[PDB]
Curated annotation (Swiss-Prot), chain B:
Residues 1-49 are annotated as: Receptor-binding motif. Changing T42K: In strain: Delta/B.1.617.2, Omicron/BA.1, Omicron/BA.2, Omicron/BA.2.12.1, Omicron/BA.2.75, Omicron/BA.4, Omicron/BA.5, Omicron/BQ.1.1, Omicron/XBB.1.5, Omicron/EG.5.1. Changing E48A: In strain: Omicron/BA.1, Omicron/BA.2, Omicron/BA.2.12.1, Omicron/BA.2.75, Omicron/BA.4, Omicron/BA.5, Omicron/BQ.1.1, Omicron/XBB.1.5, Omicron/EG.5.1. It comes from the Viruses. Changing A39V: Increased resistance to neutralizing antibodies. The chain holds residues 437 to 485 of 1273 of the full protein. It comes from Severe acute respiratory syndrome coronavirus 2. Changing V9P: In strain: Omicron/XBB.1.5, Omicron/EG.5.1. Binds to host ACE2. RBD also interacts with the N-linked glycan on 'Asn-90' of ACE2. Cleavage of S generates a polybasic C-terminal sequence on S1 that binds to host Neuropilin-1 (NRP1) and Neuropilin-2 (NRP2) receptors. Interacts with host integrin alpha-5/beta-1 (ITGA5:ITGB1) and with ACE2 in complex with integrin alpha-5/beta-1 (ITGA5:ITGB1). May interact via cytoplasmic c-terminus with M protein. May interact (via N-terminus) with host bilirubin and biliverdin, thereby preventing antibody binding to the SARS-CoV-2 spike NTD via an allosteric mechanism. This is Spike protein S1. Changing L16R: In strain: Delta/B.1.617.2, Epsilon/B.1.427/B.1.429, Kappa/B.1.617.1, Lambda/C.37, 19B/501Y, Omicron/BA.4, Omicron/BA.5, Omicron/BQ.1.1; Contributes to cellular immunity evasion and increases infectivity. Attaches the virion to the cell membrane by interacting with host receptor, initiating the infection. The major receptor is host ACE2. When S2/S2' has been cleaved, binding to the receptor triggers direct fusion at the cell membrane. When S2/S2' has not been cleaved, binding to the receptor results in internalization of the virus by endocytosis using host TFRC and GRM2 and leading to fusion of the virion membrane with the host endosomal membrane. Alternatively, may use NRP1/NRP2 and integrin as entry receptors. The gene is S. The lineage of its organism: Viruses, Riboviria, Orthornavirae, Pisuviricota, Pisoniviricetes.
Length: 49, 49, 221
């Protein structure tokens, strides 16, 4: 579900927020992305990739 | 507990432990050496006396 | 089995790798880890010329090899490279890759052929994973895990390139010495086999991640 405030669990990581499509590109040894405050700002979907 | 599988009436002697090492192991380390351990200062020539 | 003046150079800004598996963008990030200090004195071995001595492995190793015909094959790591201790052997046999932790009886002048003369015996195996260039490598050994990082570049250079995770191995052994594996030609002839060796120690670095998530510069504090 996109563009709606949801509770989510991604591979065990829980949280709350809005999910959108990104322009980033992860190297194959990466699943999560952090910001300056160590908070999770990006995630790879384990089915669609 | 496994006293119903790994126990034998006359005594099971197929499970071994290491005594008499020179120094202490490091985490997740494995030593499978079979060498004669020198307790005193006599120079063991690969025999047990 | 067949029984057949040092040099130095400077490592400017080499031996940097990704410490985490996390993606970061347009930031400066500081981290403490085992790194190769900047502007360090680095040992150089050429290839008559045939340098394959036993070198120390203190707390990790940086390795570089500038070849053009693939004569540096792999390595052997251990403590006492005889049948009394366990030892690790990484080798490319020209068609496959082998790692094969075992109890090896190693020869004094091990080498390959343009043919396989490395060891005399192998008794107890605990692991098997049989499966104009620069080719930098980094080796570490922490808590029973042998870590490898690697990077490839066409064209010691004086730039910046960060090494990427390659593999971790659960081998569980004490490692104190290592030795390089070379292949000699056809009595024998050598070739271009310059290889460079360094040593790591704990340092706090400041790395710079660009907008695509790539490390482009670093500072040694
Ligand atoms: C934890 C452990 O086993 N450490 C030993 C070390 O004392 C010894 O110096 C080295 C070879 O000398 O092999 C290893
Ligand atoms: C841990 C392990 O496999 N131990 C073996 C031992 O059983 C064998 O007798 C010896 C060869 O002499 O090599 C070692």
């Amino acid at each position: 579900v996109k563009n709606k405030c949801v509770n989510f669990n991604f591979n065990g990581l829980t949280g709350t927020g809005v999910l959108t499509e990104s322009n980033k590109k992860f190297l194959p040894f990466q699943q999560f992305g952090r910001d300056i405050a160590d908070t999770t700002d990006a995630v790879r979907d384990p089915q669609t990739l | 507990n496994s006293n119903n599988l790994d126990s034998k009436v006359g005594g099971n002697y197929n499970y071994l432990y290491r005594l008499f090492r020179k120094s202490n192991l490091k985490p997740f380390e494995r030593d499978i050496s079979t060498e004669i351990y020198q307790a005193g200062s006599t120079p063991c020539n690969g025999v047990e006396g | 089995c067949v029984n057949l003046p040092p040099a130095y150079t400077n490592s400017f800004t080499r031996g940097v790798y990704y410490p985490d598996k996390v993606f970061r963008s347009s930031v400066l990030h500081s981290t403490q880890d085992l790194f190769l200090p900047f502007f360090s004195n680095v040992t150089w071995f050429h290839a008559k010329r045939f340098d394959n001595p036993v070198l120390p492995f203190n707390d990790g190793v940086y390795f570089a090899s500038t070849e053009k015909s693939n004569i540096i094959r792999g390595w052997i790591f251990g403590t006492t490279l005889d049948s009394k201790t366990q030892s690790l052997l990484i080798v490319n046999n020209a068609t496959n890759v082998v790692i094969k932790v075992c109890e090896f009886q190693f020869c004094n002048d091990p080498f390959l052929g343009v043919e396989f003369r490395v060891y005399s015996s192998a008794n107890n195996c605990t692991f098997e994973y049989v499966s104009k260039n620069l080719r930098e490598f980094v080796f570490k050994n922490i808590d029973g895990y042998f870590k490898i990082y690697s990077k490839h570049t066409p064209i010691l250079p004086q730039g910046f390139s960060a090494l990427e995770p390659l593999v971790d191995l659960p081998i569980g052994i004490n490692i104190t010495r290592f030795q390089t594996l070379l292949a000699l030609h056809r009595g024998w002839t050598a070739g271009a086999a310059a290889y460079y060796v360094g040593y790591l120690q704990p340092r706090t670095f400041l790395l710079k991640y660009n907008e695509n998530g790539t490390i482009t510069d670093a500072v040694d504090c």
